[PDB]
A paper describes a structure:
The corresponding six variants were also made in the related S. cerevisiae Fdc1, with the corresponding UV-visible spectra, decarboxylation assays (of cinnamic acid), and crystal structures revealing trends similar to those observed for the A. niger variants. As observed for A. niger Fdc1, the R175A mutant (S. cerevisiae numbering) shows a prominent 550-nm peak, indicating the presence of prFMNradical; however, this feature is absent in the R175K variant. Activity cannot be detected for R175A, which is consistent with the presence of prFMNradical indicated by the UV-visible spectrum. Crystallization of wildtype, E285D, and R175A S. cerevisiae Fdc1 variants confirms cofactor incorporation. The crystal structure of the R175A variant again shows prFMN in an unmodified form; here disruption of the ERE hydrogen bonding network has resulted in residue Glu285 moving away from the active site to within hydrogen-bonding distance (2.7 Å) of residue His287.
Author numbering:
A (entry chain C): 3 to 502
B (entry chain D): 4 to 293, 297 to 503
The structure:
Amino acid sequence: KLNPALEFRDFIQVLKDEDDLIEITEEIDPNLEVGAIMRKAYESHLPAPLFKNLKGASKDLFSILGCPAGLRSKEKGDHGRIAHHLGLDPKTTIKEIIDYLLECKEKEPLPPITVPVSSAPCKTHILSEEKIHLQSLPTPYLHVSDGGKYLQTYGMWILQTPDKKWTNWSIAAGMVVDDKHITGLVIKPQHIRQIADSWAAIGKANEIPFALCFGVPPAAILVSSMPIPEGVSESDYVGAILGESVPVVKCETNDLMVPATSEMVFEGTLSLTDTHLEGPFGEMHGYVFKSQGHPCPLYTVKAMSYRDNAILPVSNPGLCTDETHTLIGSLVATEAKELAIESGLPILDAFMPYEAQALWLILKVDLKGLQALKTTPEEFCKKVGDIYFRTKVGFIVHEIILVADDIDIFNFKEVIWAYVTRHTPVADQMAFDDVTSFPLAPFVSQSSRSKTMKGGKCVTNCIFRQQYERSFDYITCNFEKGYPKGLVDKVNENWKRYGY
Amino acid sequence: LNPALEFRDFIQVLKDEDDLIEITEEIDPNLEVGAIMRKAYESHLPAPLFKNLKGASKDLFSILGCPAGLRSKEKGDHGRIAHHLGLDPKTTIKEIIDYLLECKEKEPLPPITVPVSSAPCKTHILSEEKIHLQSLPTPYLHVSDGGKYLQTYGMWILQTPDKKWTNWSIAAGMVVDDKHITGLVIKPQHIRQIADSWAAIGKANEIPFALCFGVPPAAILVSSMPIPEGVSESDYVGAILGESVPVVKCETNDLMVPATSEMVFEGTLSLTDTHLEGPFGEMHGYVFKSPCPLYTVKAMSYRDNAILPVSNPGLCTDETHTLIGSLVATEAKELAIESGLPILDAFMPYEAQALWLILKVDLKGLQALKTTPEEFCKKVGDIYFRTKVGFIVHEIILVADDIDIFNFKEVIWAYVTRHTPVADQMAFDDVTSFPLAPFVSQSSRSKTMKGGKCVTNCIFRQQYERSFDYITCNFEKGYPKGLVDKVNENWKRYGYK
Ligand SMILES: Cc1cc2c3c(c1C)C(C)(C)CC=[N+]3c1c([nH]c(=O)[nH]c1=O)N2C[C@H](O)[C@H](O)[C@H](O)COP(=O)(O)O
Ligand SMILES: Cc1cc2c3c(c1C)C(C)(C)CC=[N+]3c1c([nH]c(=O)[nH]c1=O)N2C[C@H](O)[C@H](O)[C@H](O)COP(=O)(O)O
Ligand SMILES: [K+]
Ligand SMILES: [Mn+2]
Ligand SMILES: [Mn+2]
Ligand SMILES: [Mn+2]
């Protein structure tokens, strides 16, 4: 019996059973080759590559699994890979996946369970400080012009507060610096930064304990990507999704708990006072820019542990569609739907289209609910923007687009139609000048707005004026919706006989 | 086969390409014609030729639908459009546009009168009391249309009182009763400009016209193109064809009609005698439940087994996008060259329902102007939105020369990643609005008819000044060609099926 949500290796096996994984046995260079193969597979929605013979590898360190949450063909279920991180039927839609995650918020949180070390495959091999050699690993060089090799693209950073009440799991990119050090972005408003600032506040900025875990339970890596509330430990919600506690063991060199079935675990201390230049790194909007960036904190690795024949999962970001659109975007959408429900807005669904590179959040609006409020477009846009852009859930989003409930927001052909035909350029767009800008957006990073970090965000009204007051019946001029059902069925029936 | 010159040769070349289905079973012109057309358009399928319409006579008529719809890439996807011009069927939309511009530099060839005996449009001739427009199997195209639309891919002919300008153009035309048709006749369209000349000398109620169906395909393409005022479209159609269009006189007035037209209607137009028109399903995808001039039909002439060509507008992609959009883009490129802007290409993406005009900028030419985003956006908007060529266009989008503007994947990528919402958009408040845009028609801007247009800057600030090298993070552009080729070569050996 396979349990893909609880075991990374069972997740591999079910993708094999669905012919959605290719074991590549010939020699592949971690320098560019891995990365280009991944981009080709993401962009035509093809099977996930599993590289078994990397140039420079040892028997144990490591294989690479690329594209762990890319899209695949509609026949097998196109979001199948996502659905298997949650233990759901491979044909489940992304609307359904979202509404499942919201149901699991109502279930009892189950905290992790400690198990004996001999039951943790992550403890099979252990390396102390003098045996750590990060430059000897077959780490990938993923994009032309990247500043280094990125070991950490699909692992889980684990940090805990000084008072021990909140342990955080999240994903952020991590670059190998030298034989013992990794560096990466630690920016507001992310929780990794909030926890580090709390270590600085009690005098320990140069010695923050961390763990970095690869090939965790798939449900854990997906909740690592999700912006749940401050103070809530990811592990307890992951337990609710699994229906059982995640099994964990303690680190060798600190008090943190790591999943027992991890492929690889790195441990150490993070310093906010000892910094290094990071990047460049190809990013979720499709670009490598040569900008040297701010200097970033340094992670010092002091121990590692791993399984026999260990597998590193990898994400290679860029043009749609990859994990930075299917996870970051759809998990912002999950929490955006939750926020509409708690603040009383009449939203049926939310979604971040892949074609818009996770910059556009579409809200599908219930028209009876909207009419009950007896409001105007100007007041509704302000209320919505104030809810979303002044909170952490809104951070990556630069344009919020409001459409009526006759639009399938999960179909980008319906969304681009409503966008160009139902909003007046400029006049139907409300600017928010004083809110936090998203620094990765290229129109921000490559402007003066990078110095100031405020504004450039908008709410765009694609709801007709009459739709705020009452019913408004119009015909949509295509085959499926423009003609009555009986005629559609008759044309579909006689299609062959006509001569097609 | 000369498909640019003969409508029946166009139908045959489509037969030879398996791009035409002769439908022989009985089909109702009430909704069924329309629905079949929509299904064909939307999956880029072969054009339906309806041979046995309920209510038809032997001669009046069949319907060809989807004459400038898209087809499979294997056959050439703009093949139908290339055939209107006599070009190879795999010619790209880029090459089609550039061909139309090269044809502006050839010598115009005015029409040539031929004998009435050699002219098929004269095979059958009806006099005034033999006109019965309600006995034609005219299509009822969209649910909630305000009536039956006979004129959707025919050619209106109007001439100035001095005889020096003959205009050919397309505009929708709805049957009102047994003798009368009504259509939109609006500024700034040449048909309104010419009608107003007749009103100015006291003949607003008796303007001669003709209406022709199944014209030479090159003529129906130019009829949809905004060429300059006072140029008779016939003369440029001649330059395109490499010969004069062959024409014959109308029975009841002095206008000349193409000799091979399937059907010709003749009469007088009145601007002061109005009737309710519409609603009609339109180029942006809607019928809304929301008073135009009257055309009096006084004579008709037609071929044996005549064929009415039909366009049914709606969602992308149909003739309102492949012709109206691309021919605005053709004239938009001509205006850039004439005004001196650094534009390599222009296109109106079909996905944006012909509301978006994308302009591909040459960065060395832009850098040579020593300008800013604010000043360039003003310069571009002032050229386009204040002239007839910019009439349908509500957003102009400026991109650099690394974007293929003919591929909508790269357009939407550039759009969302390279402009700051609002701050990088310049509103034009005092220019004329397109009254068909749904955001205009369903707001109080329907009554003012000004504003709601903008130029959106999608060129990075540094690209106005100098080189700017970044990597595009996909497979074919992100990696060296050698490595791209190596991966493609070994793809099957890895295990991909
Ligand atoms: C799935 C995923 C999420 C990335 C991500 C990537 C992936 C594959 C990469 C590694 C390919 C590239 C860039 N990533 C970063 C990122 N957030 C961040 O602060 N820095 C990052 O470097 N994220 C988002 C981050 O995981 C979410 O915002 C979480 O909500 C953070 O958790 P938190 O709410 O506990 O802070
Ligand atoms: C190809 C095509 C073009 C339509 C058109 C359609 C098609 C199929 C229809 C019939 C399906 C629906 C609506 N159309 C109208 C329209 N222009 C207009 O003034 N009224 C219209 O009703 N046009 C565009 C018109 O032909 C262009 O604006 C020309 O440039 C007009 O020529 P002009 O420069 O000589 O005035
Ligand atoms: K998280
Ligand atoms: Mn968190
Ligand atoms: Mn004209
Ligand atoms: Mn014309």
